[PDB]
Structure formats: structure tokens, C-alpha cells
């Protein structure tokens, strides 16, 4: 025993080995502080490697270090502070306020790791959010509590349908929401600031209904990693210690898989399928399992996935699929298609959905939009080349259905306005079964195709004809 | 005389169509084969390079 | 009183002897202790750390025995004490752990208390040989009457359940655990299969949903719900299934049946995966673990229909594979193909044009399949088997000037197959597939509307327990039909259609 | 003497330090007493200093560093003789049988040298086989590897069958079927259905003896098992000189098998990870298996293509071995021909004109040309109508229809099966009938005369009875 010091003997990147004194063990997972002349590096404590000498992951960058400088140890998991006065804070990873209103008043802190609540103790309802979004409502509703997944490759207005989300749910409940985003970009970043300002949910007189944690992708690879953890004790301390639900946003968590594959490699595991980390899996499952509805508080997540080269099937954004949900697809043919939200309607699907849950009507209007437009797809290689007058009567009137609720699908966002001009139409539940069972049973297969587009409920759709009419 | 000689005529074309494509399918499943056989070893070969450092 | 439980627990503290083995950690990185000490280490022995974490020996390496954790690496640290437990895995296998949701190491994750059981078995146990099986000759029922028919299943055979991703492949399984409820509800040991459900890497969310479900059809009596949940490690997702193979051989053993679903060996997979490229131990094809296929083997021949000389039992499984993007090529689901004797093959296309179950009957196959097919059964489904096929040839002549023939086997076709969606998680006894199924084969349902089907259907049955159930007692306890049978049941369908 | 304590369990590769001087050789075996019996190491390696890297052949389960080893001397010594005919061995050659020890008189190290380029004969003689189909259109050789494909769903398992009573008949064999990775379930369905044919009678002489790998066998024991099956048929062949014919099951598990082998020893996997011993492997199996001048073992391999891709290096090391493809199908089966032979899809490479005889070579041409343009007429005789087309068209047709059922035979084996006396038709008299029927001597006798039917000879017989 002698005073708990390290000294560091290899920087090789993010991985920097520290060589603490004899007889003083640091502990697997725990957190060392560095003082620097930029603040205090932290290295989290992953491996012992024997001698007293560990190999822990850096979390601010590396650089000018000395082989040799002393390392303290502030023991355990980084511990954040949490209270309801991280509410409307931007807090980076180590827990400094990027907010820059001074230091964030500590009430209690937490561990940033810590074991999923047992099956025993986990309880989990069936409850509904309602989204008040045409596509969503009807077909892959969302429900409290749950994992809700914003599943979506490059470009698919993610944003957009992002700022929709927070605009029309997260305003609608109460409880907390947490905003984390992590390893994106600063130009998102940015955005998602000044947005939450201005919808004034950030509200810097009066408690705001949101915390923050921005993490970037400029953070070193490390960082990015375990921004996530972070995040997710936040929202812990409000389901526990506050007992009230929370509306947890996570965004984009295939940058928390592909932060974790890196720091796979730099610590130093042989690479799994796709240069994958082997722990993925279990990272994965890690995260998830933490995530979930207890008898206190109901996290709701709601969480943003990128797929790499809309390849679904590449492991990565496959093995997030299974953990979530309510999945949610947007898709990058039907954005082009101009239907806005771009979810593509046979792929999007959600837990509940089923008629013992969500209700026979409700289910049984579903169900004659799903076999439809799955009928219509179907088609789309035969009408290709042989035309539409080559199939049958029915299948030709059926077609045309399609097409008509293929474009009502196409429902504006309220946060398009600012991208283009559309003005968003807010859909309630109710009416959204109503409006698709209306244009099925063929009571509006009179209203033009294009009468379709861009146009809410079927009350729209009836004003949208008036105004083709003339 | 048209009409009949027409409706022959795509049937007569539409089976040598069907020919055509039948070749082509054989020639895209030893594509296929192919490109099959080489995802699997060069995906060793990364395994491979990594486990050997 | 909360005083007297806690007074309890602190008594039943006291002592210890002689701590035979410890070891010394001298690296843990990545949840593999490496330990100095443990001489004489069994191999995939099970050890206690200074923690409590226990772990396995997959690694006796010359002088450093590579401990594996079970536990998370945060509790565990270097120089630790390594008690030797000195059992190898094992877990407790008896008769009490139905209705006992368990984790791996048996521990009640439910809280229904200590498990009572008759014996605590190893879990590499060899599966029985050649000569102690005796070939199947007992049909397993599902209540889904696609499965029965089209894909009979049998007893100790395996069939895979190999299918795209979350189509609610869970859903398809769960359904023949309901219908082993009406067996079960019998006296006979004959008519009872204990069900196992294997929940490799499941979320604890999806565990609550498959708890309430089996309360709710009552299903908690002769089930047991093996949990590996996803934040359980991958030693404990490793030996999951192993572990829930034994409590099924303690069944087998008994000469009892029982169906143990795994489901999916491609979390299983995952698991072998992390544990072998973190052990260093040389990775192979798809970056699955070299060995990955004698793995699979292993678990898969443990399911055993067996012989008279052993008393003939049964432990009938349904591995359950996840294909992503639909590959049977991909490495994992090769493997278990081969392996494996018949596969049913789920198919997302049919999913979304609402035939649920969405078993595509092409993909599907079993390799023992009708020889456990009920024999009222099978009488009245030959036919069934060669109109579906023809349904499927003539199916793209669905795009005008189409032959009578065509015509006809299109109409037929398309009544069959709205017959075969059935509502999931509501089984259909025999007594009652078997009178659907027979309407069919007569054509006399070819006749009825199509948006009538399902109408007709449970009309048609109601009607036959109005207008005899008697028939249906004798088709139910016979299990043969008759001629005289047949004939009633032809007249029956014929004045059901005509109302 | 030589004993050593196992100092190392990593996986299933064993590594045993041995005392001074007193080092197993490779290829030896080593047995350390278990509670399990036996747990039979074989040396693979030598790490040095009085150490070893060995593979196992039994599960490694709980065992210790610290085990006493015992070293054989040499690779496992497996019993043979007539005796061993009609038992069930593991691959540690004791019996799985249940019938009790296995009397035996010599054993025989698993791993032996292929006969000499001298051993070699000159050129390859037809081995007669009871299958009409067979001898015609691709007669099997004595030596020879002859590739049955089509798995089970064209009665896969009679015909095998079929091939032992006909081996039996034929020589005076005897066979071995080996089953080289072999689901258990399919193991119990062949011992029951053997034993039911009588091929195997325990109580009676049982012709084929049984070596059968099961899956759950670790994969050391899965490479093992077919090298183990080899020197029994080596015993009958150059030790008692009967011809004898060695059934493998799936090749397609040796290969695998063989991958994995590798992989454990730590050897980089070659390309679509097979083994960087691919041609080895194969090449010692399959040189083993040659025509001796003292005897012949000829070889029935079944080759589960893996993934239908003939490409894989699998199957092209598999293809080079193999001298002739007899291609059972189940679209033949459903045309209600048994044999399943697809007459169109038999090959063999001991076809060769000079080989089989001009004559014969010309025959089995006529009825070759005269399959190929049966097919092809009978794709445009469905579509446009039999009459529509010409008189010599529908004179092939008829002369087709009749070679068609011709080769249907009834056979010896499933005379208990189907009731129906069995048909043994001799290679003379197989090249006879074909000569008749190409002559059209019989080409007035209706189609279903020949269906089911032996040789000529025989559908004389049915001429008369189809009449009374």
C-alpha cells in the first residue's frame, strides 16, 4: 500500500496503460482521473493485466501525455450527478455542463453502470401512446413504456421525423423526457438545441421537461461509447428516485454500436463478423435491458438507428432490431415516393398491434390496408411489363385502392413547414381508424388518386377534393 | 386472318422469351456461385489477418 | 414476520471447513480470469470467486487455468481468491421445476422458492446411442392444423422452425404449448408432453409476455421456462441450452414425453461466439467459432424417441433459427439444417398477405412427418398435400383467358388456403381439424364464398356439435375413420353447405 | 511403460507431458483411463520437451491435468474378421452393438499406407451389379468410386441395400456401411431396417457390417471414423481376398469433419474455410480405396453437395476422386421406376468404349440417344399432341416407352418389402436384352409387360402372362 497512483507507460491511442503502485488493486470499471492542463482526462479502468498494471479507455483525448504522470483514482463507475437540476443542463460525458450555465447544482450522484432490474422486479405493462401520425397510429401504434424504434438508413428525413416525435409525444406526456443523443454531428446538434429552445420544452426560466446529453462524434472513440451509459443512468434516477415515467430519446444508437466495435478493436479483441465487437451482443442486450418499465417509473424509449447501406441484415443494425419493440421503418423508396413520413408501411410493425390489444376495429382496418398494399407490391413486377390490362378485374380495382392509400399515407409533418411549406396535420387516434376504413370499404373510391397526398384524415381528403374539384 | 396470326405470333415469341431467359439464368447462377464462394474467403481472409497478428 | 424470514436466513449461516483450491487472478480483461492455482481443476468445473461469480474452466491451460466468468467483470478483480466449487455443471432436474420460471443455475428468477427436485445432473450428458431409441410412432399434435397436416410432428424427432426475423416465430411455437394443454389435462402419461421453453437471449420484457401468456392459458403445470435472458452473460447464454436439455432428460429418463423448444440457437450461436474469440481459441467460418457445428450437434442429437428396453419416452424438440434476410446459405443456418430432420419454414411475404400462420408449405418438410400423423388424419389429407401443390404451380396464372382446369384448381386453392389462416394463440383440438380439413377434400367449401370462409368455419363447427357430437366423440376416441364415418361426415358437410 | 500426465485441456486438443525418452511417435494412440472407460488421445503433434498435442475421440469432459496417460504404441488397433461382420463399432473399435465383446482374432492400426504403385492393377474390370440400370448405362469397376447422389426420398437405403445382396451374389463379398457423421436418427431407422431385410441377421450370417458415426461424436472421432472403416474393408479384401465394397455416408460430413480437425490443430482453414489438408485427406481415403491384386474394394459414396454448388472446393476435391455418378432421383421414383436411376443423369468415366466392350459401348449408346431424344420428343408430345407427330417419332416414342419400364426391376432385398420375388440379372444378359429390344424383337409386346420385369428371358414370361 503507498499512496493510489499511476504512471503511465504506453500510449498507444485511446488505450493508455497505467502502471499503479503495488499492493492497491484498481478495480475493474473504475474511474481514473488525470489532471491535465485541459481538465482531467478520464480513463475507465477495463482491464487488469497484472504487476499493477491496468489498461483503461480514454474519454477525452490523448495527447502530450508523459509517460508517467500520476494518476489518481476516483474509484468505481464515473459518477454523474443526477437531480431534477439536470433538468434543461447539457451534460457531456464526464457530467461537465456544456451547457455553460455554471457548475450543475449536485444533489445525488450516480454510477454509470449498473444491473438491469431482475425479471422478478421488472414489471411491464401493455399501455398506448398515441402518435396522432396517420402510418404510425394504424399500423405500428406506439405504446408506453416500450422500446420504440426509429429504424431508418442515410437520409430518410430522420431529423424530420425526429423533430415531429418530440413535438407531438413528447410535449403531450408529462413526466421527464431525456434527450441524448449520441456521436452526432454538430450541425444536428446545433439543431436539436435551438429547436427544444424554441419549442420552449428547454424553457430556461421554469423546469424544463428535458435534460440533455450531447454527445458528438468529434469525442474520441472511447467517449462515444459510454456516452450512452451515461445517459442512461439519467434516466434511471427519474424512473427511480422520481418514480415518474420517463420519455427516454436516444439518438442515433448505431453510433453507439460502432463505438463500441471500435473500442473492441483498440482494446485489442479479435474482430468479430463485420469487424464487429465480439461483446456486441451483450453490449447490446446491456443497454436494452437497463431500458425498461419497472413498477416505479416507465422508461419509454424511443430510439434512432442508422443502417448502413440500407442493409437491415448487416449485423450491427440486425441485432439491434430484435431488442426493440415497436419498430419503425423508414425507407428510402417510399421518401422518394414523396410520402412524408417516409415509414414504409410493410415493414414498420409493433408488439402492439393485435385486436386483443389495440382493439377488433382498429385491427380489422389495419388488416385490410396491410393484405392490400402487400398485394399491390406483389403486382408491381407484372404490371411492369405486361400492364395493368392483363390482370384481374378485382386485382384492377384493388390497384387502384393501393394507390389511393398509398398516398394517404403521405400525411404532412408540422415541422415540414420549415423544410418546404407543408403544414402538418395532427391526426387524432380515433379518426385515423375512421379515415382509412372509409376509403377501403370504397366510400371515397370516387375522390381522385392525388386527392390522397399530402392530405391528414379522411375529413382532409374530402376539402382536398373540393379544392381539385376546382 | 391478323388476329390469329398475331395472338400465334406471341405465343410463338414469348416461348422463345422464356428461352432466352432460362440462359440466363444459368449464366447469373454461376455468377452466383461465383461471387458466393469469394464473400466467404475473403471474408476468412480478414479473420485470418487479424488472428495471425 | 419480515424480522423472523431475515432471523431465518441469518441462522441458516454457520461454519465452513477447508477451502480447497484457491487460485490468485492474475489478469481479468474481457470476463476471462486467468488464474494461477486450481491444480487439479476438472475440466468446465464450476468456481467460486472471492465475489461470489462463478465460471467454468473451458480453458486448462499449462500452468494458468482460464476461469470464465458467469458474473460481470465489475465484481470480479485481480489476486482474487478462486474457491473451487468441485462440481461440474450441474443443474437440479426433478419433477418440481414445473411452473418454475428458472435461470440457468435453477435459481427462481420468479421467486417461487427453493426448487424441488430428485437429482442434480451433469449437463454434458451423452445423448443414447443407436440401439436405445426406438423409431417414432407417436404424434405430437399442435392444434395448428398447417403443422398437423402439412408437416406432421412426431416424438424425440426435431424440426426446425427456421424463419425470418420477429414474425412472431415465438407466436407459432407458443401455440403448440396450448394445445398440449388438452392432452395434459388427461390422466395418462401417454397424453402427457412436459413443455420446456428454452428463452435464449430473450428480453426480460419478452419473458413478462411469455410469463403472463402461459398463466393466462393456464399453461404454468407442466411448463418450465428455461431463462437466458439478453443481459445474462454468455457463459450462462452458452450453457442455456444444455442446461435446459438436462431437465428434459430427467423426464426421458422417467420414460415420460415432453417437447423442448429452443429457441434460438442463433442467440446460442452469438454466445459460443463471444466466449471463443475471447478466449483466443482459434476463430473459423462467418466468425463463428471453429467448432460452432459440434456445438449444434451436440444439442441437437440429445432428443431421443426411446427404445421399449428403455421404456420408451420421448424428448420431441423444435430448435427455432432466425434467418437474416431469409439465408438459409448463411453459416449458422446451414449447420442446423443439416443437422436437423425436417424444417418448417416461416416466410414473411405470406405474413404480410395475412396468412397467419405464415408457414410457407413449399419451405416446409419433415423428414419423419407423416409417420406420427394421426390416422383419421391422414386419411382425409393425402389430398390436401397434392391440391396445394397444384395451387402453388397454377398460382401464377392468376394474371383472364384461363383454362377450366386452371380455374378450378384456383378456386380450390384459394378456399384451402383461407382455411389455413387460423387466429394465433387459440389451438384447434384433432377432433375438430379433422372435419374442417374433410369439407375441403370433398370441395364442397370450394362452393362457399370467400369472404365466407371464415364464417363458414366456425359454423360448420358449432353446427357438427349441434347436429353430432357424437360423431365427433367417435372420431375423437376412435382416431380411425370408418367408411360409416366417412360417409356420415360427407353427408354432414353436405347439409351444413346447404344451410 | 510409457505414461504420461495430460498437461493441458484447452478444448479438445489434449497436450500430455510424457517422462524421458519415452515419447509417443505421431499417429500413435494414447488411452487415459476415465470413468468413461477410455478416452482415446491421438498424438497430432509434437510441442517438444517431452510434451505432445493430441485430438480426442471421446468427449474431454471434467477431466484433470494430472490424468495418468497410457500410450498405445500406434494408431488405434481395430479388431477385424468375419467375426467382426454383423456388429455395430464405435471408433474406438468396440462394439456399440450391445451384443457383447467382439470375438476377434488380430486388430489392425486405423491409419495404413494405400497399396503400392506395384499393388496397382493395370486397368479397371467392370464389378458386376445387379441393378440393370446400373450395368448399363454406367457400369461399376472393381477399385472404382462410384458416386450414388440423390439422398433418401428415392429409397436410397433399399438401394443400398440392394448393393449388398447383389455384392454378395455377385463375389462373395461382404460390405461395411460406414456412415461418416450420420444423424443418430437415421442410424436407428438403418439397424432396424437391416436387421428387418435380413442383410443383417444376427441370429442368421450378417453380410454388412456396421460402423456408424453419430453426430454428437466429437469431431476427432468424426474425422476418424472413415480411416477406421477402411482397414476393416482392407482386412476382407487383402486378407481373406474377398472383393468387398465399402458404402461411405455423406462425404460431405468427411470434409467437414476434416475442417474442423484443422481448425482445432490451429492450422489457417484454405479457402471457403477447408482445411489446408484438403487433398491430403482426401487423398489418403481415397487411395486406400484401389483395386489390390489380391482383392478389390470399390466404394459407394454419398456426396451432399453443399448448397447445390458443385463449385465449392468440397465438392471438386470429391469429383476427382470419383470414377463414375450413379444419380438416383425422385422425379423417377414418381414415373414408379425402382431403380431410381436417372438414366439421363448416370455418368461414368468407366463408360469408356474400349473399357466396356465396342459392343456394349454401341448399345448403351442406341439406348442413350434413344432416352435423350425421348425426353426431348416428350416435351413437344405433351404440347402437341402424339399423333402430331411423325410415325418414326412416335416409333422412338413407343420403342422408349418400353426401355422406360424395362429398367424397372423388383428387387432380391425388398422381396420382403414388396412381396414380389427378386430379379439378379448377369452382365451378359443385361447386355442381351438391351441388344433385343434396339433390334425391336420384342417391340411388339406391350409397355406394361415390361414394367417390373427382369431380363429378356423374363419378359417372355410376362408376354404370356399379360395375354393370360
Given at each position: ?117 431482475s425479471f422478478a422486479e421488472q414489471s411491464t405493462s401493455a399501455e ?164 425498461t418499465t419497472?413498477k ?55 408488439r402492439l398491434?393485435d385486436?386483443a390489444v ?113 | ?53 | ?94 419433477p418440481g421445476l414445473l411452473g418454475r420460471v428458472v435461470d440457468?443455475?435453477?435459481?427462481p428468477i420468479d421467486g417461487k422458492g427453493?426448487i424441488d ?26 392444434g ?24 412472431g416465430?415465438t407466436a407459432?411455437a407458443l401455440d403448440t404449448i396450448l394445445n398440449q394443454k388438452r392432452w395434459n389435462n ?6 402427457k408432453l412436459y413443455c420446456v421453453y428454452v428463452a435464449?437471449?430473450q428480453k426480460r420484457s419478452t419473458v413478462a409476455q411469455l410469463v403472463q401468456t402461459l398463466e393466462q392459458h393456464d399453461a404454468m403445470k407442466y411448463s418450465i421456462i428455461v431463462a437466458?435472458t ?17 431437465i ?10 415432453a417437447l423442448?423448444v429452443?429457441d ?160 394465433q394463440y387459440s389451438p ?72
Open positions: 500500500s503507498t499512496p493510489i497512483t499511476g504512471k503511465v507507460t504506453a500510449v498507444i491511442g485511446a488505450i493508455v496503460d497505467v502502471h499503479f503502485e503495488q499492493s492497491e488493486l484498481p478495480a475493474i470499471l473504475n474511474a481514473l482521473e488525470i489532471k491535465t492542463p485541459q481538465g482531467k482526462l478520464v480513463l475507465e479502468v477495463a482491464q487488469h493485466l497484472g504487476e499493477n498494471t491496468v489498461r483503461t479507455i480514454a474519454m477525452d483525448g490523448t495527447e502530450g501525455l508523459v509517460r508517467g504522470e500520476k494518476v489518481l483514482d476516483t474509484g468505481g463507475p464515473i459518477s454523474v450527478p443526477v437531480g431534477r437540476e439536470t433538468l434543461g443542463r447539457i451534460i457531456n460525458v464526464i457530467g461537465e455542463p456544456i451547457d455553460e450555465r455554471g457548475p450543475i447544482k449536485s444533489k445525488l450522484r450516480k454510477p454509470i453502470h449498473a444491473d438491469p432490474p398506448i401512446l398515441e402518435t396522432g401520425i396517420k402510418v404510425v397510429d394504424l399500423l405500428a401504434p406506439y405504446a408506453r413504456g416500450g422500446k420504440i424504434g426509429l429504424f431508418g438508413g442515410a437520409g430518410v428525413g430522420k431529423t424530420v421525423f425526429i423533430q415531429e416525435l418530440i413535438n407531438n409525444i413528447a410535449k403531450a406526456h408529462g413526466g421527464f423526457s431525456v434527450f441524448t443523443g449520441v456521436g452526432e454531428r454538430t450541425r444536428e446538434g446545433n439543431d436539436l438545441y435551438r429547436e427544444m429552445k424554441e419549442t420552449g420544452v428547454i424553457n430556461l426560466e421554469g423546469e424544463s421537461k428535458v435534460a440533455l446529453v450531447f454527445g458528438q462524434m468529434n469525442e474520441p472513440p472511447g467517449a462515444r461509447a459510454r456516452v450512452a451509459l451515461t445517459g442512461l443512468t439519467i434516466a434511471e434516477y427519474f424512473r427511480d428516485e422520481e418514480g415518474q415515467d420517463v420519455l427516454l430519446f436516444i439518438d442515433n444508437i448505431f453510433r453507439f454500436t460502432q463505438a463500441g466495435s471500435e473500442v473492441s478493436a483498440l482494446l485489442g479483441r479479435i474482430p468479430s463478423a463485420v469487424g464487429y465487437q465480439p461483446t456486441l451482443a451483450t453490449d447490446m442486450g446491456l443497454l436494452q435491458e437497463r431500458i419497472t416505479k417509473g416507465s422508461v419509454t424509449s424511443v430510439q434512432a438507428v442508422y443502417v448502413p447501406a440500407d442493409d437491415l441484415t448487416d449485423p450491427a443494425p440486425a441485432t439491434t432490431f430484435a431488442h426493440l419493440d415497436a419498430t419503425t421503418v423508414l425507407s428510402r423508396g417510399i421518401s422518394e415516393l414523396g410520402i412524408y413520413p417516409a415509414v414504409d408501411p410493410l415493414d414498420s410493425k409493433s398491434l385486436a389495440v382493439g377488433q376495429e382498429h385491427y380489422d382496418v389495419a388488416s385490410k390496408v396491410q393484405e392490400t398494399l402487400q398485394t399491390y407490391k406483389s403486382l408491381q413486377d407484372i404490371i411492369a411489363i405486361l400492364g395493368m390490362d392483363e390482370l384481374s378485374e378485382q386485382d384492377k380495382l384493388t390497384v387502384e385502392r393501393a394507390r389511393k392509400i398509398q398516398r394517404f399515407l403521405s400525411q404532412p409533418f408540422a415541422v415540414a413547414e420549415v423544410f418546404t411549406g407543408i403544414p402538418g396535420k395532427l391526426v387524432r387516434l380515433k379518426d385515423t381508424v375512421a379515415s382509412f376504413k372509409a376509403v377501403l370499404e370504397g366510400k371515397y373510391d370516387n375522390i381522385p388518386e392525388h386527392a390522397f397526398y399530402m392530405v391528414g384524415g379522411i375529413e382532409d381528403v374530402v376539402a382536398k377534393a373540393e379544392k381539385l374539384a376546382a | 386472318q391478323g388476329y390469329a396470326a398475331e395472338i400465334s405470333a406471341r405465343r410463338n415469341a414469348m416461348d422463345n422469351a422464356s428461352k432466352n431467359a432460362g440462359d440466363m439464368i444459368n449464366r447469373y447462377s454461376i455468377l452466383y456461385n461465383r461471387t458466393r464462394q469469394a464473400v466467404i474467403t475473403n471474408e476468412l481472409v480478414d479473420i485470418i489477418t487479424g488472428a495471425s497478428s | 414476520e419480515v424480522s423472523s424470514i431475515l432471523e431465518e436466513r441469518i441462522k441458516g449461516v454457520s461454519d465452513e471447513a477447508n477451502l480447497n483450491e484457491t487460485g490468485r487472478v492474475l489478469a481479468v480483461g474481457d470476463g476471462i480470469a486467468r488464474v494461477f492455482g486450481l491444480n487439479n481443476i476438472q475440466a468446465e468445473e464450476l468456481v467460486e470467486f472471492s465475489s461470489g461469480v462463478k465460471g467454468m474452466a473451458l480453458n486448462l491451460e499449462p500452468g494458468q487455468v482460464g476461469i470464465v466468468l458467469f458474473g460481470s467483470d465489475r465484481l470480479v478483480k485481480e489476486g482474487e481468491l478462486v474457491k473451487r466449487t468441485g462440481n461440474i455443471v450441474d443443474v437440479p432436474v426433478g440457468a443455475l435453477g435459481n427453493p427436485a430428485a437429482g442434480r445432473s451433469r449437463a454434458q450428458v451423452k445423448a443414447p446411442g443407436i440401439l436405445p431409441r426406438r423409431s417414432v410412432h407417436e404424434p405430437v399434435q399442435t395448428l392444423k398447417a403443422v398437423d397436416a402439412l408437416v406432421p410432428i412426431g416424438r424425440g424427432q426435431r424440426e426446425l422452425i427456421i424463419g425470418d426475423r420477429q414474425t416465430k407459432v388427461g390422466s395418462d402419461e401417454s397424453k435464449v437471449g437466458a439478453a443481459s445474462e452473460a454468455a457463459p450462462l447464454q452458452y450453457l442455456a441450452p444444455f442446461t435446459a436439455a438436462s428434459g432428460e430427467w423426464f426421458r429418463d422417467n420414460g415420460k414425453h423442448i429452443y434460438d440457437l442463433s442467440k446460442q450461436a452469438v454466445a459460443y461466439r463471444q466466449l471463443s474469440l475471447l478466449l483466443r481459441r482459434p476463430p473459423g467460418r462467418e466468425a463463428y467459432p471453429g467448432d460452432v457445428f459440434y456445438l449444434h450437434s451436440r444439442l441437437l442429437e440429445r432428443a431421443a424417441k426411446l427404445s421399449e428396453k428403455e421404456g420408451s419416452g420421448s424428448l420431441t424438440a423444435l430448435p427455432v433459427i432466425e434467418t437474416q434476410g431469409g439465408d438459409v446459405s448463411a453459416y449458422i443456418p446451414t449447420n442446423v439444417i443439416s443437422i436437423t430432420d425436417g424444417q418448417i419454414f416461416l416466410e414473411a411475404e405470406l405474413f404480410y398477405k395475412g396468412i397467419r400462420p405464415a408457414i410457407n408449405v413449399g419451405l416446409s418438410v419433415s423428414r419423419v412427418g407423416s409417420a406420427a400423423q394421426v390416422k383419421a388424419l391422414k386419411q382425409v389429407a393425402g389430398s390436401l398435400k397434392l391440391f396445394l401443390a397444384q395451387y402453388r404451380e397454377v398460382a401464377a396464372f392468376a394474371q383472364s383467358d384461363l383454362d377450366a382446369s386452371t380455374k378450378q384448381t384456383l378456386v380450390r386453392g384459394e378456399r384451402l388456403t383461407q382455411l389455413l389462416k387460423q387466429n384447434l383440438a384433432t377432433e375438430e381439424q379433422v372435419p374442417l380439413i374433410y369439407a375441403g377434400v370433398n370441395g364442397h367449401l370450394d362452393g362457399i364464398e370467400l369472404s365466407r370462409i371464415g364464417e363458414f368455419e366456425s359454423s360448420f363447427l358449432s353446427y357438427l356439435k349441434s347436429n353430432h357430437n357424437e360423431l365427433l366423440t367417435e372420431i375423437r376416441e376412435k382416431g380411425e375413420l370408418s367408411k360409416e364415418l366417412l360417409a356420415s361426415l360427407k353427408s354432414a358437410t353436405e347439409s351444413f353447405v346447404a344451410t
